[PDB]
Design a binder for this molecule. Structure first.
Ligand code: HEM
Ligand SMILES: CCOc1cccc(C(=O)O)c1
Ligand SMILES: [Cl-]
Length: 393
């Protein structure tokens, strides 16, 4: 009764244009079976939202990738928060919440916004730039590693390590095999910076290590919690900011509405997160036999959630293929939903807002003037190169 589909959502053809296949996944039924990897799939908004908010049945401690930790060894020690279930997930999550707290954003917002204005001012002096390397990558690299309290040496390992982690969530294809095949130097750097003496005072890293005496985490848990921020804190904001610029480059009408009201910068970034969904997919594992969308799913089965497809489901969104900076984006699953919803979404929204704010006040037009190249990742959707000409306001 469950439709079987041969679509490979982790193929280069799928990444190149996933929207026709995503509607096919949605319309085939509420629950599908992907014969390519022997997993269940949910593509409509309702089932994606239901699975995310049922952590007891659709657990994360057996891996949020394709690999089942009950069957295969994890390529790295499991994350204490992303790949953990309640109650073991509760207190590590609370520490990262207080480290990336609303009170923390007040201390870094001015420096984050000043670096965004300075970056746009610098890019306008060049004219024709690469919105990926010179903006989507250059800006987060100019604020986040310093906010983490990282030293200067070795920062070129951060993005390769992140692309490795998100490629590792995928199936054992060549993208995943090649990533782990080039991995030992990157984890050696990242794991070393997770140690307390290597994190500058005042940064997120030192703040995590200071939370070890409250009884919420132990000193031996702090390095892996810092590893979470070094795994997910940079590459997500790169593809999130690269998505917003790509949207404003393809939709000049929305760029003109943003210029007229720069206070829309926060929602313009949030709508970009829904439109592109830089975090495309995540898995869950059934801890029991469960009925979902008229389909019964056995225990220990992998269920693939299409977050990007749920953000474009016409059963939930009106004109889902339209970029609307004034759309009420509340409910989108670009940051997840439930107990695992993005704990660093305040940092991500701060970086996105101040960057779109700088563009809104300083840029009059963003025109693509070069060949667009896509970056292929088993989890992340984003561009490799985006040549644009920036016209000063
Ligand atoms: C555009 C930017 C971002 C997007 C689209 C995004 C997306 C997501 C999503 C979809 C989840 C849910 C994962 C799941 O339910 O299995 C998540 C969780 C998480 N994110 Fe973000 N994220 C972003 C930025 C960040 C930043 C800036 C940080 C840290 C500084 C971060 C750290 C984390 C962590 C640690 C988790 C695990 C939370 C948990 O398991 O309770 N992310 N993110
Ligand atoms: C989508 C953000 O979620 C992530 C991604 C990669 C690593 C981790 C972690 O907890 O180390 C979390
Ligand atoms: Cl590692």
């Amino acid at each position: 009764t469950i439709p079987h589909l041969a679509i490979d959502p982790f193929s280069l053809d799928f990444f190149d244009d996933p929207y026709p296949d995503q509607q096919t996944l949605r319309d085939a039924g509420p629950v599908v079976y992907l014969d390519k990897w022997n997993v269940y799939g949910v593509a409509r908004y309702a089932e994606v939202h239901a699975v995310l908010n049922d952590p007891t049945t659709f657990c994360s401690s057996r891996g949020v990738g394709l690999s089942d930790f009950k069957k295969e060894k994890p390529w790295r020690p499991p994350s204490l928060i992303l790949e953990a279930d309640p109650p073991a997930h509760t207190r590590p999550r609370a520490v990262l919440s207080k480290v990336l707290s609303p009170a923390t954003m007040k201390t870094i917002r001015d420096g984050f916004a000043a670096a965004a204005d300075a970056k746009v001012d610098e890019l306008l002096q060049r004219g024709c730039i690469d919105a990926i390397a010179d903006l989507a990558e250059a800006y987060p690299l100019s604020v986040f590693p310093d906010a983490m309290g990282l030293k200067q040496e070795g920062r070129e390992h951060l993005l390769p390590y992140a692309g490795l982690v998100f490629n590792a969530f995928g199936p054992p294809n060549e993208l995943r095999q090649t990533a782990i095949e080039r991995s030992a130097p990157h984890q050696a750097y990242v794991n070393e910076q997770c140690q307390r003496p290597n994190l500058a005072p005042g940064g997120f890293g030192a703040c995590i290590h200071a939370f070890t005496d409250t009884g919420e985490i132990t000193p031996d848990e702090a390095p892996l919690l810092v590893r979470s921020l070094l795994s997910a804190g940079l590459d997500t904001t790169v593809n999130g900011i690269g998505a917003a610029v790509y949207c404003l480059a393809r939709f000049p009408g929305e760029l003109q509405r943003l210029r007229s009201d720069p206070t829309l910068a926060r929602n313009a970034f949030e709508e970009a997160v829904r439109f592109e969904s830089p975090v495309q997919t995540f898995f869950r594992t059934t801890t029991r036999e469960v009925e979902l969308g008229g389909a019964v799913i056995g225990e220990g089965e992998k269920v693939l959630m299409f977050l990007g497809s749920a953000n474009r489901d016409p059963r939930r969104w009106s004109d889902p293929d339209l970029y609307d900076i004034t759309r009420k984006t509340s409910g989108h699953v670009g940051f997840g939903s439930g107990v695992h919803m993005c704990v660093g979404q305040l940092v991500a929204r701060l970086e996105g807002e101040v960057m779109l704010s700088a563009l809104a006040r300083k840029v009059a037009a963003i025109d693509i003037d070069g060949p667009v190249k896509r970056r292929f990742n088993n989890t992340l959707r984003g561009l490799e190169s985006l040549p644009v000409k920036l016209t000063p306001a």
